[PDB]
Amino acid sequence: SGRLWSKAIFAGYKRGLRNQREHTALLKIEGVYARDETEFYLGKRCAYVYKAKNNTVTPGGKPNKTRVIWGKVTRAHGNSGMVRAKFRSNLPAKAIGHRIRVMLYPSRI
Amino acid sequence: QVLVLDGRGHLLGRLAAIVAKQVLLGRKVVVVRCEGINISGNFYRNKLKYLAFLRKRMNTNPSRGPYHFRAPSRIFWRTVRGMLPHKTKRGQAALDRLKVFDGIPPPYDKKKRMVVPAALKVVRLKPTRKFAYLGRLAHEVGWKYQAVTATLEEKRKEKAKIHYRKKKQLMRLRKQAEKNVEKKIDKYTEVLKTH
Amino acid sequence: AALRPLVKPKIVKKRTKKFIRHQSDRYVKIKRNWRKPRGIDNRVRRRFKGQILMPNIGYGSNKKTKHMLPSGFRKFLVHNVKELEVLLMCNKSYCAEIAHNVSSKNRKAIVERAAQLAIRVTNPNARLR
Amino acid sequence: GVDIRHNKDRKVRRKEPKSQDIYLRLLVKLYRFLARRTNSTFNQVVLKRLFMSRTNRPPLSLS
Amino acid sequence: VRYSLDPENPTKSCKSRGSNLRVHFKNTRETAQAIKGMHIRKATKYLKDVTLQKQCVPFRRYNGGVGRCAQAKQWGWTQGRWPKKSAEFLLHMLKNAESNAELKGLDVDSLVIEHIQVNKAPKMRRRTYRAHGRINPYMSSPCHIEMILTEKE
Amino acid sequence: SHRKFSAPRHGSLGFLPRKRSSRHRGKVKSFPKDDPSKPVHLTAFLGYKA
RNA sequence: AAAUGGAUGGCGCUGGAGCGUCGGGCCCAUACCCGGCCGUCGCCGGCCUACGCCGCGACGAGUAGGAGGGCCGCUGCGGUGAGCCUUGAAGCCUAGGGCGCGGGCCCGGGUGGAGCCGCCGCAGGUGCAGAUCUUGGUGGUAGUAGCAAAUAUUCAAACG
RNA sequence: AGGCGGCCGCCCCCUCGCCCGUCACGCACCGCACGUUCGUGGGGAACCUGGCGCUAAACCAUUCGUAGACGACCUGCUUC
Ligand SMILES: [Mg+2]
Ligand SMILES: [Mg+2]
Ligand SMILES: [Mg+2]
Ligand SMILES: [Mg+2]
Ligand SMILES: [Mg+2]
Ligand SMILES: [Mg+2]
Ligand SMILES: [Mg+2]
Ligand SMILES: [Mg+2]
Ligand SMILES: [Mg+2]
Ligand SMILES: [Mg+2]
Ligand SMILES: [Mg+2]
Ligand SMILES: [Mg+2]
Ligand SMILES: [Mg+2]
Ligand SMILES: [Mg+2]
Ligand SMILES: [Mg+2]
Ligand SMILES: [Mg+2]
Ligand SMILES: [Mg+2]
Ligand SMILES: [Mg+2]
Ligand SMILES: [Mg+2]
Ligand SMILES: [Mg+2]
Ligand SMILES: [Mg+2]
């Protein structure tokens, strides 16, 4: 029991002022508010949990209504502690203002 | 979840910047006591700028056009409207997540109110600069509800005093309990590991 | 899982949109085929951002993965038994595809000869009885 | 771009002979092989003159 | 002949078609949208009320410049009009569909109107006489009508 | 421009939002204020213009 | 001091989100470096469609215009496929599968009923988005304007 | 812009409602993801059952003129 993943709010794509680059996303992760603090999360793996009405899940026992686009942290971003992340597929852009799980695997504890 | 913010002693643009940044991420923030939000500068200048804002109106039809709110909660809500992308369905969802109240509602009388240190008058102003009250501005121009809000505010302040005396009595009782004995075996461990 | 051709890598196409013609949405007299606009005011020719993209040489697919079906073969059209038997030497890279005007009576003989010679055919089970 | 110089991509040359004479193409094949395999600048010049046109190969006279 | 929206089964369904009949296409479409999805006796009483101007027909799509009525509040709409000629023709085709159901041997008291279709017949042309010696067309708009009536259980 | 004969304006902007009123009985927009010094009484009645 | 209400972009900003001097980080363009792929050009290899096959390197924007390639396409002619078919050709439709970067193409499914196509050469009345383009058809307008020059009709019956 | 909390007396039990020590078990599913949560999550259409109750009102039609371009608005209708 108990949550094993750290909370991180999706903030938006990597962008300029005008144009965007949808292959890289930004994460405001809670607790981290510093460039020196966003060092431990380099290499963590992220997961966007969302819902659909067709029966497609992981084969861990039971078929359900939960879909996940996987991905992982690439590097840090800015001085405020925001974190870049490249997922395996690009974001649906509905995920703005929603939470992406950051699970505590392969990093170097 | 919800972020219940006090409005006393905060500056309008600083609090609007912090609220408009924290509402785009999804944290449902509610600014309570909006009549106490201060504005730097002279109060004559602030009501002159608000009178100029009232003077801005469409001449061919004043109804179809600029809607000039006089209530201070709606003043702060227009202030955050001008900072969020409200023409898009990101700032529209952010304005749906944002709630604002003049005076204090009963659930926010119940819950605890936060205070943002970066938006404070004392933090952001040299103490010999002039300031204003948004409730004073709203009563001086349009919003005719200062007396009822002040009466209900004094009523809930009396309620808060009669709750605080009970809470402080319970805290004196629990420190008498901490003054009593047969608890120290765990307390040595807690002092050695940050009491 | 029929014939499993030789080592074919990950096939990428570098875009898969078959680029639309400008203002084909606005007028239905304009077919969806690409046609290079040669106007003096056109945003597509001037290559403004946010407009459609013109097909140029940079979208060229790899020569290793050129004309590649997703099964891993390259298609070759066939009318009859001699043009099916010409695929006898390279049957593990160049698959057969029966022409549309071939009747069912000869089509069953062609697909039986392809099953004998172990030549992949794209449409074996079409126009049967 | 990168190159500030002008772009003269193809220089001048005629590599394949434009004539469809089969015998001339066979001589082109043979003397191309000899020109790249013998280090003979005679074979180089004869291969270039076989690439050369009808007008630019003027008729020699017997005298 | 073929229709649109072929029924569940031809045993429990009758059919009717009128072709090249002098009405307005817009009036017959807007009354067919009110006929559709209704019991046959309710539709017959409704069309008699239309011919007696006691219950109207709401114009929902072809509502350009159509005056209002108080009777359209049954339909949740504001505008209405009372097509006498369209009501007479579609009542005659409802009687024809009733006779076809009687010939096919259906339980004639429990028919609902499942499908109705109205589409533009080739219109016939006459001419006006406008100013400055000009001739302008004066064209009709007849329609083809199909209807399917099905036993409701 | 410069109309050369300035006239007072026709009508009134304060009465300009003209409409068939949804009420037929003229409702009271504002009653007079109260005080504990005055005795108990009513303010408004109904009538019919004979 | 200027005429509709309005512009440091707006919101706001005073221990600055203003001014002047600056420091350390941070954000990105089709700019630069590394790498994958296409094409052009240059230099080249081989006695493996020689008009094919590889090798290395540098560069690719562009109206008017000028060239090259097109296994892009339409029509007909000579050769050519012991070509295709009434066990279904052309044509048309298609929330189907695919290829090419594109000109376009191949197959699946449905109507259709008698002609059609691949390759090498040949010859064009050979490609449409416009020209107040020509002919034909069809919408919004729209069940709208309109059926108002000259005093006027009414009851009953009959054929229906 | 109110619905959970506090007191008295009973109800069927708990003297493990907790911290430290002993013992043995529960799937040990043999390297792997979306697992654990306020969920007897929001609303709509129906299925079988207990208890307690409910028995109407709009719109059209007719009339009305205090209003009406048409809609709309104010109105009457009982068997005294
Ligand atoms: Mg220009
Ligand atoms: Mg122009
Ligand atoms: Mg370059
Ligand atoms: Mg209109
Ligand atoms: Mg009208
Ligand atoms: Mg006329
Ligand atoms: Mg009032
Ligand atoms: Mg300003
Ligand atoms: Mg500065
Ligand atoms: Mg170029
Ligand atoms: Mg062809
Ligand atoms: Mg021509
Ligand atoms: Mg000709
Ligand atoms: Mg045309
Ligand atoms: Mg043109
Ligand atoms: Mg024209
Ligand atoms: Mg027309
Ligand atoms: Mg009119
Ligand atoms: Mg009219
Ligand atoms: Mg009679
Ligand atoms: Mg008679």
Whether the CB of A97 is below 8 Å from some CB of chain B: the reply is: yes
Chains F and E touching, counted as 3 or more CB pairs less than 8 Å apart? no
- Which residues hold their Cβ within 5 A of ligand 2, which is an ion? C 41
Ordered DSSP codes for E97-153 = HHHHHHHHT--TTSEEEEEEEEEEPPPPEEE---GGG---EEE-B-EEEEEEEEE--
The distance of Cα A95 from the centroid of its chain, to the nearest Å, equals: 10
Dist CA E82 CA E31 (whole Å): 9
**Separation of CA D4 and ligand 10 centre (Å):** 16
Dist CA B98 CA B92 (whole Å): 10
Among the partner residues B25, B93, B94, nearest to A11 by beta-carbon distance: B25
> What percent of chain A is helix, strand and coil (3-state, nearest 5)?
0, 45, 55
Angle CA(E15)–CA(E16)–CA(E17) in degrees, nearest 5? 135
Distance from the Cα of B87 to chain A's closest Cα (Å) equals: 16
Nearest residue of chain A to residue B25 (CA atoms): A97
Distance from residue A84's CA to nucleotide G26's C1', rounded to whole Å: 14
Distance from residue B65's CA to nucleotide H18's C1', rounded to whole Å: 66
A20 closest-nt by C1' vs CA: G28
Ordered DSSP codes for C18-48 = --PPTTTTT-TTS-SS------SS-HHHHT-
Angle CA(A8)–CA(A11)–CA(A17) in degrees, nearest 5? 155
B60 closest-nt by C1' vs CA: G4
Dist CA B79 CA B89 (whole Å): 18
Whether the CB of B90 is below 8 Å from some CB of chain A: the reply is: yes
A contacts of B25 (beta carbons < 8 Å): 9, 11, 28, 97
Nucleotides of H under 7 A from a protein CB: 1-3, 33-37, 59-61, 66-75
**Separation of CA C26 and ligand 14 centre (Å):** 15
Dist CA D50 CA D17 (whole Å): 7
The set of long-range contacts for C112-120, using a CB threshold of 8 Å and a minimum separation of 24, is: C113/C81, C113/C84, C113/C85, C114/C84, C117/C84, C117/C85, C117/C87, C117/C88, C117/C91, C118/C3, C118/C91, C119/C84, C119/C87, C119/C88, C119/C91, C119/C95, C120/C2, C120/C3, C120/C5, C120/C71, C120/C73, C120/C91, C120/C95, C120/C96
Give strand pairing partners of A47: A70, A101
Radius of gyration of chain D measured on its C-alpha atoms:
16
Number of C-beta neighbours around residue E84 at 10 A: 12
Which residue, among A15, A83, A96, A98, would best test binding to B if mutated, counting the most B CBs under 10 Å from its CB?
A96
Dist CA A102 CA A85 (whole Å): 11
A contacts of B93 (beta carbons < 8 Å): 97
Task: Give backbone dihedrals phi and psi of E51, rounded to 5 degrees, phi first.
Answer: -65, -25
Q: What determination technique applies here? A: cryo-EM
E67 closest-nt by C1' vs CA: H70
> What percent of chain F is helix, strand and coil (3-state, nearest 5)?
0, 0, 100
Dist CA B36 CA B104 (whole Å): 12
- Which residues hold their Cβ within 5 A of ligand 6, which is an ion? E 129-130
Residue contact B26–A11, C-beta within 8 A: no
Evaluate the CA torsion angle B42, B43, B48, B53 in order and state its sign: positive
B40 closest-nt by C1' vs CA: G14
Q: Report whether E94 contacts E40 (CB < 8 A).
A: yes
Q: Tell me the residues of chain A between 6 and 35 that have a Cβ less than 8 Å away from chain B.
A: 9, 11, 28
**Separation of CA C36 and ligand 1 centre (Å):** 17
Dist CA E68 CA E45 (whole Å): 22
**Separation of CA E126 and ligand 17 centre (Å):** 15
Task: Give backbone dihedrals phi and psi of E120, rounded to 5 degrees, phi first.
Answer: -80, 120
Distance from the Cα of A51 to chain B's closest Cα (Å) equals: 18
Helix segments in D1-63, DSSP class H: 22-37, 41-51
Number of A/B CB contacts below 8 angstroms equals 14
Q: Report whether F44 contacts F32 (CB < 8 A).
A: no
Task: Give backbone dihedrals phi and psi of A87, rounded to 5 degrees, phi first.
Answer: -95, 175
Dist CA A72 CA A87 (whole Å): 6
Ordered DSSP codes for E12-26 = SEEEEEEEEESSBHH
Distance from residue E149's CA to nucleotide H47's C1', rounded to whole Å: 31
Residue contact A28–B25, C-beta within 8 A: yes
Distance (Å) of CA C2 to CA C5, C9, C76, C119, C122: 9, 19, 18, 10, 11
What are E6's two structure tokens?
A: 């072929």
Distance (Å) of CA C47 to CA C25, C42, C44: 19, 9, 5
What are E23's two structure tokens?
A: 């009405």
Distance from residue D60's CA to nucleotide G158's C1', rounded to whole Å: 124
What are D42's two structure tokens?
A: 């005679």
Q: Which residues contact B4 (CB under 8 A, 6 or more apart)?
A: B30, B32, B108, B111, B112, B113, B114
What are A37's two structure tokens?
A: 């603090």
Question: Reported resolution in A?
Answer: 3.6
Q: Report whether E42 contacts E55 (CB < 8 A).
A: no
Q: Report whether E58 contacts E34 (CB < 8 A).
A: yes
Number of C-beta neighbours around residue B168 at 10 A: 10
Whether the CB of B25 is below 8 Å from some CB of chain A: the reply is: yes
Q: Report whether E151 contacts E107 (CB < 8 A).
A: yes
Q: Residue C78 carries which DSSP code? A: E
Q: Which residues contact D48 (CB under 8 A, 6 or more apart)?
A: none
Whether the CB of B93 is below 8 Å from some CB of chain A: the reply is: yes
Dist CA C54 CA C45 (whole Å): 8
Whether the CB of B26 is below 8 Å from some CB of chain A: the reply is: yes
Among the partner residues A28, A96, A99, nearest to B90 by beta-carbon distance: A96
Dist CA B68 CA B56 (whole Å): 9
Residue with tokens 């949990």: A49
Dist CA C105 CA E83 (whole Å): 61
Q: Which residues contact B17 (CB under 8 A, 6 or more apart)?
A: B83, B119
SS3 B124: helix
SS3 E80: coil
The H or E element containing residue A87 is: strand A82-87
B contacts of A97 (beta carbons < 8 Å): 24-26, 90, 93-94
